[PDB]
Design an enzyme around this catalytic site. Structure first.
Site, PDB file in Angstrom:
ATOM      1  CG  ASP A   4     -51.782  -2.298  30.818  1.00  0.00           C
ATOM      2  OD1 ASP A   4     -51.338  -3.225  31.261  1.00  0.00           O
ATOM      3  OD2 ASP A   4     -51.875  -0.837  31.229  1.00  0.00           O
TER       4      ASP A   4
ATOM      5  CG  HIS B 190     -55.112 -11.365  31.072  1.00  0.00           C
ATOM      6  ND1 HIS B 190     -55.650 -12.239  30.005  1.00  0.00           N
ATOM      7  CD2 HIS B 190     -55.049 -10.160  30.552  1.00  0.00           C
ATOM      8  CE1 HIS B 190     -56.052 -11.529  28.959  1.00  0.00           C
ATOM      9  NE2 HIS B 190     -55.452 -10.269  29.267  1.00  0.00           N
TER      10      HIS B 190
ATOM     11  CB  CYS C 199     -51.120  -7.471  32.786  1.00  0.00           C
ATOM     12  SG  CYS C 199     -52.183  -8.477  33.955  1.00  0.00           S
TER      13      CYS C 199
END
Ligand SMILES: [Cl-]
EC number: 3.4.19.12
Length: 260
Positions: free
Chosen positions: A49, A254, A52
């Site tokens: 999300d 990410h 992260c």
């Protein structure tokens, strides 16, 4: 709720599941995980999300906590929300995932949870406690409000220093050179407040995160495998006493957690 940091698995089993076929991208990612696997046997998948990067960093930092760092021992920490918000009324533009009490509650929680983890005798007791803390409930997301607030505070301090003509680290020049982040209010409105499914910390904000929690963040950047950025350390020259946490980023957005 369910875990937001997934139970560990073998890192090469993870790589073999995610990266198949013969594209140059897949080959580079495989080489990347092969290199990581020389030092770490396992990986924990971090919820992808908008939090992260914060989740990955905080889970590592807290699960490895053997003491309470001085910046969390400092009584000034609890005084910061009233002092900052009183002085800078635009901070009330803050969007939550009154304001002073909410932020103070979040900072008190961060300090209490960190102190409790540092009290534990074994890494296993810490991991159990962290596995309970990062279960997608209000306590987890309160931790991110606290850290975001410390990022804003460090940004204000760096901005004010640069106005005074004091020496500042160059990442802060790059942070405020962005047309959407020319001053701390734009940083708050356009980056820290950001919209679900689009946000996440940018590269330059990883320096700010490291400064805010006084941790050295060592990131395997797999999209940079065949370059000197295959690892980037945030900040570049930290105090030698800052603890080190290691992350993996397949792209510069990410992050997952290597563990051993
Ligand atoms: Cl499989």
């Amino acid at each position: 709720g369910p875990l937001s940091v997934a139970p560990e698995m073998d890192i090469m089993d993870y790589c073999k599941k995610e990266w198949r076929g013969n594209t140059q991208k897949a080959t580079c990612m495989k080489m990347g995980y092969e290199e990581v696997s020389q030092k770490f046997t396992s990986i924990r998948r971090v919820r992808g999300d908008n939090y992260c990067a914060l989740r990955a960093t905080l889970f590592q930092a807290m699960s490895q906590a053997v003491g309470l760092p001085p910046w969390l021992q400092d009584p000034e920490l609890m005084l910061l929300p009233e002092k900052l918000i009183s002085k800078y009324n635009w901070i009330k533009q803050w969007k939550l995932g009154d304001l002073v009490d909410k932020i103070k509650e979040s900072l008190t929680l961060l300090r209490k949870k960190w102190a409790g983890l540092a009290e534990m005798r074994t890494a296993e007791a810490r991991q159990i406690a962290c596995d309970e803390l990062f279960t997608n409930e209000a306590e987890e997301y309160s931790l991110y409000e606290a850290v975001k607030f410390l990022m804003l505070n460090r940004a204000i301090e760096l901005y004010n220093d640069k106005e005074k003509g004091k020496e500042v680290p160059f990442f802060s020049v790059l942070l405020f050179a962005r047309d959407t982040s020319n001053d701390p209010g734009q940083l708050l409105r356009n980056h820290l407040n950001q919209v679900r499914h689009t946000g996440g910390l940018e590269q330059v904000e990883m320096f700010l995160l490291a400064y805010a929690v006084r941790h050295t963040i060592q990131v395997y950047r797999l999209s940079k495998y065949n370059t000197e950025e295959f690892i980037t350390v945030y900040p570049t020259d930290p105090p030698k006493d800052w603890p080190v946490v290691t992350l993996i980023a397949e792209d510069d957005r990410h992050y997952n957690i290597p563990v051993r």
